[PDB]
């Protein structure tokens, strides 16, 4: 069944595109500066930076899942 290997290639492409888009916006999402010098501005900017980072981690885990799945298609064929 060649079709399973085909799928595995597609799933790997999907992984490549997720991490690509993620890495593409990381420099903006993780670089959020506080609008002003007050505590509210700073806390908001900090939260957003941490939120962007936990998202980057979440996608990396999804990339792992995608790759494990594509591997289940190849070695499982």
């Amino acid at each position: 069944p060649e079709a399973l290997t085909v799928a595995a290639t597609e799933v790997r492409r999907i992984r490549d595109r997720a991490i690509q888009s993620d890495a593409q916006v990381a420099p903006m999402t993780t670089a959020v500066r506080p609008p002003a010098a007050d505590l509210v501005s700073e806390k908001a900017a900090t939260f957003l930076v941490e939120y962007a980072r936990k998202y980057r981690q979440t996608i990396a885990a999804a990339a792992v899942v995608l790759e494990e799945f594509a591997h289940a298609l190849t070695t499982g064929a």
Binding site: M28, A36, A37, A44
Partner: peptide, 14 residues
């Protein structure tokens, strides 16, 4: 403090 920083442009890019 509110007039200090660089404004919201960084937040809007994000």
């Amino acid at each position: 403090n509110i007039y200090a920083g660089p404004g919201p442009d960084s937040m809007l890019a994000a």
